[PDB]
Amino acid sequence: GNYNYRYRLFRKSNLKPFERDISTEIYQAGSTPCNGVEGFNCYFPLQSYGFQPTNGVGYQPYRVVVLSFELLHAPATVCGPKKSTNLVKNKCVNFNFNG
Amino acid sequence: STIEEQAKTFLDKFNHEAEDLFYQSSLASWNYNTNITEENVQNMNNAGDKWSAFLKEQSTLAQMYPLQEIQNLTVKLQLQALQQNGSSVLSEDKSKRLNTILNTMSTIYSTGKVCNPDNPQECLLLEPGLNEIMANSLDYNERLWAWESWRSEVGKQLRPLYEEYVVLKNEMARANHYEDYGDYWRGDYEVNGVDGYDYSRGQLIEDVEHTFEEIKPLYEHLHAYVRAKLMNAYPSYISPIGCLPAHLLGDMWGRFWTNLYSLTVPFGQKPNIDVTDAMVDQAWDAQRIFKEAEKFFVSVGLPNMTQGFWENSMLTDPGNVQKAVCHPTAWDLGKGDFRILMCTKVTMDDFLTAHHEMGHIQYDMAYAAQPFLLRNGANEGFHEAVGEIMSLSAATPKHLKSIGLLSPDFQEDNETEINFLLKQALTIVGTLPFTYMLEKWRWMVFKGEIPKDQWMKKWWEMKREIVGVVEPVPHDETYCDPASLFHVSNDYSFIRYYTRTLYQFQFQEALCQAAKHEGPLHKCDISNSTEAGQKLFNMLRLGKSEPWTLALENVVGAKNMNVRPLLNYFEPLFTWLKDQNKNSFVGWSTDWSPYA
Numbered sequence: 142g143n144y145n146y147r148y149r150l151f152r153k154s155n156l157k158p159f160e161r162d163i164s165t166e167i168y169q170a171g172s173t174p175c176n177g178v179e180g181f182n183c184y185f186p187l188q189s190y191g192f193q194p195t196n197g198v199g200y201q202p203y204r205v206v207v208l209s210f211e212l213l214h215a216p217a218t219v220c221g222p223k224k225s226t227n228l229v230k231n232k233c234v235n236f237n238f239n240g
Numbered sequence: 241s242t243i244e245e246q247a248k249t250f251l252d253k254f255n256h257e258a259e260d261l262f263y264q265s266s267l268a269s270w271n272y273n274t275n276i277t278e279e280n281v282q283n284m285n286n287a288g289d290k291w292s293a294f295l296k297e298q299s300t301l302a303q304m305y306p307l308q309e310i311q312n313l314t315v316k317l318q319l320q321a322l323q324q325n326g327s328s329v330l331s332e333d334k335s336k337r338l339n340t341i342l343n344t345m346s347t348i349y350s351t352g353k354v355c356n357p358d359n360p361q362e363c364l365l366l367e368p369g370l371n372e373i374m375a376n377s378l379d380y381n382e383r384l385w386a387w388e389s390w391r392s393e394v395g396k397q398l399r400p401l402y403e404e405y406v407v408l409k410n411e412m413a414r415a416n417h418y419e420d421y422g423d424y425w426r427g428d429y430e431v432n433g434v435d436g437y438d439y440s441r442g443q444l445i446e447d448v449e450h451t452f453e454e455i456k457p458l459y460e461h462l463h464a465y466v467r468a469k470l471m472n473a474y475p476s477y478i479s480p481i482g483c484l485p486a487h488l489l490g491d492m493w494g495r496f497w498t499n500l501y502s503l504t505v506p507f508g509q510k511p512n513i514d515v516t517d518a519m520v521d522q523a524w525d526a527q528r529i530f531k532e533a534e535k536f537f538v539s540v541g542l543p544n545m546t547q548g549f550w551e552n553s554m555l556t557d558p559g560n561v562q563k564a565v566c567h568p569t570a571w572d573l574g575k576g577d578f579r580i581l582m583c584t585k586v587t588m589d590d591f592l593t594a595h596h597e598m599g600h601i602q603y604d605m606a607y608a609a610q611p612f613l614l615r616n617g618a619n620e621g622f623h624e625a626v627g628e629i630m631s632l633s634a635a636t637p638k639h640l641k642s643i644g645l646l647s648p649d650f651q652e653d654n655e656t657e658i659n660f661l662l663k664q665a666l667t668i669v670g671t672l673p674f675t676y677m678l679e680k681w682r683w684m685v686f687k688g689e690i691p692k693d694q695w696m697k698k699w700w701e702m703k704r705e706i707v708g709v710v711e712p713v714p715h716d717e718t719y720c721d722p723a724s725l726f727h728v729s730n731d732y733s734f735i736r737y738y739t740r741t742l743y744q745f746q747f748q749e750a751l752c753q754a755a756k757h758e759g760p761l762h763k764c765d766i767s768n769s770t771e772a773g774q775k776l777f778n779m780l781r782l783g784k785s786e787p788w789t790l791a792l793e794n795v796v797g798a799k800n801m802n803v804r805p806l807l808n809y810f811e812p813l814f815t816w817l818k819d820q821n822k823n824s825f826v827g828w829s830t831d832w833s834p835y836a
């Protein structure tokens with residue numbers, strides 16, 4: 142059992158976009174103060190994932206990579222590969238060299 | 241903040257921390273079942289103790305949230321399920337005594353060996369040997385000897401244990417605000433809080449009697465026919481006016497009458513619908529059996545089996561070196577892991593069992609979307625009923641012809657339908673009075689209607705009145721005749737078979753009406769019908785989230801269990817039995833006229 146993957150199970154409010162919460166403070170679900178100890182109505186918000194190789198496809202671990210593309214007023218520098226057509230000489234052709 | 245939000249977060253934490261633990265316990269149990277080794281037994285015991293202690297601690301945390309301040313039906317259902325004390329309300333000494341009594345009854349039943357006096361050098365156990373003797377012998381005194389000796393040894397060992405067991409279970413049940421242990425068992429069907437669809441614990445017994453009153457003429461005709469055939473087989477033992485001798489019913493206890501099909505066949509000269517030889521000739525492996533079952537389930541529109549099912553299941557006997565339990569069992573290990581443990585042979589019975597267990601797997605898969613503590617059937621009847629409907633559908637000659645296992649030129653006349661319906665009645669109809677009598681007797685024992693010194697005198701009186709079976713010789717109070725059965729000795733409910741039997745034919749009528757079948761109900765096959773599968777899956781996906789009455793409304797359109805589909809299923813057989821019983825006398829006498 143691979144328990145090296147934890148998730149946040151409870152928070153008072155939803156996260157903002159592109160926010161990371163790594164706090165390990167006890168969640169207060171009740172009126173009583175938690176006082177830093179996990180007792181009754183007070184739970185630790187980070188819980189481990191159980192990953193076994195014999196689990197179903199809806200419970201198997203999935204690695205997710207999200208690529209975020211943003212355009213800002215700065216000159217854009219992460220460009221795609223620019224496919225290059227072979228060079229033809231001595232003919233009247235339409236040339237596009239570096240824009 | 242509020243109590244409901246606190247309960248919702250607690251239930252989320254509970255499901256999260258109980259899913260991995262349930263998966264570990266189930267995996268340990270699986271490793272024990274497929275590999276009987278002492279370390280696997282130790283791992284199973286450790287996992288079970290951890291699971292029970294964790295459930296006790298979570299129930300202790302769960303009780304601090306009062307029920308009446310929660311309005312959501314699913315949250316209230318999970319809190320009601322978790323807040324049950326079980327044996328925890330009872331004192332630690334009495335709880336330990338009850339656990340010890342249950343374990344020692346399990347050891348006595350499992351390792352009980354009985355053989356004939358004056359020849360004690362070797363003895364036979366019930367499951368390896370006595371079952372075959374009860375099912376195949378035609379000798380009166382041998383069956384009488386086996387029956388009386390096994391009930392003598394088992395009853396004389398288990399009678400003080402059962403006397404302690406009834407008192408401890410009644411004490412635990414009254415400590416849990418129930419009238420008796422019977423009320424605790426009837427609380428599974430209790431629906432509270434739903435407008436119109438409420439069901440009471442007291443209504444269950446009345447409904448069972450109301451259905452049994454309509455069961456009674458068909459059972460009387462079947463009993464008369466079986467009595468006449470056994471009179472033909474045994475000339476002098478059976479009386480025309482009295483009950484049947486107890487040891488002649490084809491099984492050890494009278495649970496099923498399916499071993500009397502050879503003796504009570506209407507038309508022996510006509511052939512059977514046995515397809516075993518065809519699979520032997522075409523070399524059908526058990527893998528092919530499960531693939532054909534999967535083809536049947538995809539034909540009706542249900543989801544197909546997962547890759548983990550095919551990879552991780554054991555569908556063949558491993559060998560001499562590795563020991564495994566031979567009983568077919570479908571395992572929902574948790575986290576989407578579904579397996580079948582069956583030692584599948586090339587027989588019709590194993591094929592029907594494969595369909596039944598894959599129906600169990602489909603039922604388990606359907607409620608995977610539900611929360612962890614609601615991952616069960618709405619009642620105990622539905623879980624078995626959804627497998628029994630597959631057992632009904634797969635056994636039809638149309639299904640056998642469709643999959644190629646039966647010859648296309650097989651003549652389906654009325655005689656084969658009559659004898660097949662009689663076999664299905666001996667398996668299905670015959671268990672109903674025995675089940676009803678046993679459950680009613682246990683309910684009266686728990687309720688205190690019957691004193692301890694009068695348990696057996698009433699019991700045989702019930703058996704003559706309901707089952708129409710007479711004792712061979714009178715039994716005193718030193719015997720404990722009910723507790724020789726597996727379910728009663730190991731604290732299992734028995735009304736599930738009665739409810740399963742009625743729900744089976746109700747679901748069968750509903751799916752056949754969905755599939756637009758235009759013939760007899762027993763000639764109906766639910767393959768190729770997407771709408772029938774959709775109607776089934778609507779109830780299947782709910783699990784325990786909804787009341788069983790609402791689920792029954794979803795399937796059959798009725799708010800209560802009904803007896804008319806069973807009578808409609810066996811109506812040609814009912815007319816045939818009424819025709820055949822003109823000379824004979826329907827009904828029995830409770831007196832000692834045959835033998836006592």
Ligand SMILES: *[C@@H]1O[C@H](CO)[C@@H](O)[C@H](O)[C@H]1NC(C)=O
Pocket residue numbers: 275277562
């Ligand atoms: C069953 O147990 C034996 C002994 O522990 C072991 O050698 C064998 O590999 C096990 N079989 C399986 C299928 O794990």
Ligand SMILES: *[C@@H]1O[C@H](CO)[C@@H](O)[C@H](O)[C@H]1NC(C)=O
Pocket residue numbers: 248312313314315
């Ligand atoms: C009840 O709770 C479940 C999950 O706990 C939620 O999906 C459902 O919407 C709730 N029902 C009501 C009526 O709030």
Ligand SMILES: *[C@@H]1O[C@H](CO)[C@@H](O)[C@H](O)[C@H]1NC(C)=O
Pocket residue numbers: 303323324325329416417
């Ligand atoms: C469980 O037992 C405790 C202590 O006896 C009791 O307070 C509680 O009400 C019981 N729970 C139920 C559901 O009966």
Ligand SMILES: *[C@@H]1O[C@H](CO)[C@@H](O)[C@H](O)[C@H]1NC(C)=O
Pocket residue numbers: 544545546547550
């Ligand atoms: C189940 O069905 C889907 C879609 O028809 C298919 O992709 C999948 O391979 C099937 N699974 C198995 C185990 O055959």
Ligand SMILES: *[C@@H]1O[C@H](CO)[C@@H](O)[C@H](O)[C@H]1NC(C)=O
Pocket residue numbers: 654655658816
């Ligand atoms: C079957 O039908 C034939 C002709 O209709 C009839 O003679 C025979 O008695 C019937 N058998 C049964 C068991 O109904």
Ligand SMILES: *[C@@H]1O[C@H](CO)[C@@H](O)[C@H](O)[C@H]1NC(C)=O
Pocket residue numbers: 539642767768
């Ligand atoms: C149901 O579907 C299967 C799979 O295509 C087919 O073999 C069978 O003949 C169909 N049944 C009928 C009655 O057409």
